[PDB]
Curated annotation (Swiss-Prot), chains A, C:
Effect of H116R: In P-Galveston
Effect of G73R: In Aalborg; unstable
Annotated phenotype, changing Y144C: In Rainier; O(2) affinity up
Gene assigned in the entry: HBB
Variant or mutagenesis effect after changing K143E: In Mito; O(2) affinity up
Modification(s) after translation: Glucose reacts non-enzymatically with the N-terminus of the beta chain to form a stable ketoamine linkage. This takes place slowly and continuously throughout the 120-day life span of the red blood cell. The rate of glycation is increased in patients with diabetes mellitus. S-nitrosylated; a nitric oxide group is first bound to Fe(2+) and then transferred to Cys-92 to allow capture of O(2).
Effect of L13R: In Soegn; unstable
Impact upon substituting C111F: In Canterbury
Substitution effect: H142Q: In Little Rock; O(2) affinity up
Misc note: One molecule of 2,3-bisphosphoglycerate can bind to two beta chains per hemoglobin tetramer.
Stated name of the protein: Hemoglobin subunit beta
UniProtKB/Swiss-Prot annotation, chains B, D:
Site (Not glycated) location in chain: K10, K55, K59, K89, K98
Organism for this UniProt entry: Homo sapiens (Human)
Record note on what altering R30S does: In Prato; unstable
Gene name of the record: HBA1
Effect of substituting G21D: In J-Medellin
Name of the protein in question: Hemoglobin subunit alpha
């Protein structure tokens, strides 16, 4: 439950986010830091080295879709279970992704936002974003519940 | 904990140096605000921002991290006094350790962008996961 | 998500389950296998070694309360969230227990069931009880999820 | 892992002996029945009651486990060949290792009640988790 102060600070920082790169950077880092998540992206190609994952064009293109889904959740915070209904069906019934990996990618996105904004990404701003990434991960796992 | 990971942690905490006490305290501040449940382990601490206790405690966590970097080959015996403080008299959940590890990585990403490379990010996460399990074992 | 064959096997085995001497070893083994959970039960006194935890009158008495809560939910499988509604609040905001510990006790309960029944707790019986322990753990973690 | 836990583990899997190859086969079977999503890791396999594929692989898991108890003070190097298969080639999610260790703990409790004591249980869960940590670490 985000306070209007947290809500406003969340939209302000997100408006300055590089829509074209941040997503790919977050999906790329998840694949390098947590190397088991690579199983779900075998049809993507070279991931052998950390530079192969980051440089990969489909990791960037797929990350763009993932960021788009995150931006979707930020616009509709009070309806997360609904916003991610089809994706929760996709990731649980069709893809069989463990819900723990959603918590990891959400945290990796937080690390990326910190890496891009620096000291602008202050502790109360991270606290607000932790509510969002926990909310998205929980909503992406409702099909298991 | 491959030799490549041991090399990365050195090049990451090398640029830290004197900033250790400042970074460690920020990681705690980030943990108390983002995860307010961890505060229950510190009721004897004034968790309000601008605390000498958090700055001093941050320095302790940071120097213990610097101590753990040097003894990466034999961590269970080097952090023996620590693995007794948290596991026996504090009985802290390993979930809280994952939270501090994550908050530590966020601080390093915000302060050292050039050093927060995916390889260093993977190495530091693995190193902190090893420090966490050492500190969350032999519980009794 | 339990079918008639699963729902019957769950109740038939529970009839043999002693409500007063099953939860005690479950709560006890939780405090021995995962000892960080002792922080919540420190009014109890001594929990020094496994024998002290098992031979603790407060541990076995609290186990009856836990297994008693599990038993009522086993009859009301249709709406577990409503049955565990009051407990889900007390276990999350009143006393800050991490939602990971809920499935730890559930998987420990499953280990106690196998230990008691032996060959009687067959793989399809375990499969039926797994959906229950996951359900109960989910119903007790919704007051943040 | 404590030397007290090492004495509990050596004694527990010392009583399984020859049955381990059948215990591992039951534990395997229990994982597919209890958690069906784990079956994706076996695309060709016939995972039904009383199958030679499950029984044969059950012996492989148990043989790797008997080597792990004998090499309790040297696990990353003794299980190195297996840590490469599970992490580089198979790239199994660490959650699945928590799922199999649980079913293995269920099988041990069902067949060995006089041995499966809370002290042995805590050591067994610690042993299996460290075996899991080793098996799912050689990756990047
Ligand atoms: C928790 C945050 C996540 C979000 C918001 C998210 C979002 C998405 C979106 C929007 C798609 C697009 C599907 C389509 O083309 O219609 C997608 C696909 C997919 N996601 Fe996720 N995802 C998340 C986490 C994960 C994680 C952690 C994994 C793996 C460990 C994963 C694996 C996949 C896979 C394998 C696909 C299918 C890609 C393909 O077409 O081959 N996702 N995800
Ligand atoms: C206690 C933990 C585990 C042990 C000791 C273990 C041990 C083994 C051993 C010894 C082999 C045969 C290796 C060889 O001879 O080349 C094997 C193969 C395999 N293991 Fe594991 N394993 C464990 C956990 C898991 C888990 C949790 C999964 C997945 C859910 C898994 C999936 C596999 C697969 C897929 C194979 C190869 C089977 C095939 O041919 O497709 N293992 N494991
Ligand atoms: C949220 C709980 C918590 C976590 C996750 C945690 C995680 C860590 C990690 C993991 C990276 C490290 C290296 C670490 C290091 C330290 N902690 Ni932790 N500590 C925690 C709660 C404490 C508390 C509480 C104390 C003691 C307070 C005091 O002043 O006595 C503590 C004290 C310390 C000290 C000082 C010990 C002393 O006084 O002898 C060090 C060093 N630590 N702690
Ligand atoms: C390790 C922590 C922990 C876990 C995992 C846990 C898991 C569970 C689960 C299964 C997921 C169930 C069904 C369950 C049921 C109960 N718990 Ni839990 N409880 C836990 C810690 C407690 C504590 C602590 C209390 C009461 C102590 C207090 O301070 O009042 C408690 C009290 C209860 C009570 C009694 C309510 C009351 O005090 O009136 C029931 C019933 N429970 N607990």
């Amino acid at each position: 439950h985000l306070t209007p102060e947290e809500k406003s600070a969340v939209t302000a920082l997100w408006g300055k986010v590089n829509v074209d790169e941040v997503g790919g950077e977050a999906l790329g880092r998840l694949l390098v830091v947590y190397p088991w998540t690579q199983r779900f992206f075998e049809s993507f190609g070279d991931l052998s080295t950390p530079d192969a994952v980051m440089g990969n064009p489909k990791v960037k293109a797929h990350g763009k879709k993932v960021l788009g889904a995150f931006s979707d959740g930020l616009a509709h915070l009070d309806n997360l279970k609904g916003t991610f209904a089809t994706l929760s069906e996709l990731h649980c019934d069709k893809l069989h992704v463990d819900p723990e990996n959603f918590r990891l990618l959400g945290n990796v996105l937080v690390c990326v936002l910190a890496h891009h904004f620096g000291k602008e990404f202050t502790p109360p701003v991270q606290a607000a974003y932790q509510k969002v990434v926990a909310g998205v991960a929980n909503a992406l796992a409702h099909k298991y519940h | 904990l491959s030799p490549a990971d041991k090399t990365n942690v050195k090049a990451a905490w090398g640029k830290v140096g004197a900033h250790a006490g400042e970074y460690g305290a920020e990681a705690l501040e980030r943990m108390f605000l983002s995860f307010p449940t961890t505060k229950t382990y510190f009721p004897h601490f004034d968790l309000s921002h601008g605390s000498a206790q958090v700055k001093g405690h941050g320095k302790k966590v940071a120097d213990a991290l610097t101590n753990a970097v040097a003894h990466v080959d034999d961590m269970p015996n080097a952090l023996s006094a620590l693995s007794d403080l948290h596991a026996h008299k504090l009985r802290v959940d390993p979930v809280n350790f994952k939270l501090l590890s994550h908050c530590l990585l966020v601080t390093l990403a915000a302060h050292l962008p050039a050093e927060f490379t995916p390889a260093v990010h993977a190495s530091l996460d693995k190193f902190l996961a090893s420090v966490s399990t050492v500190l969350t074992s032999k519980y009794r």
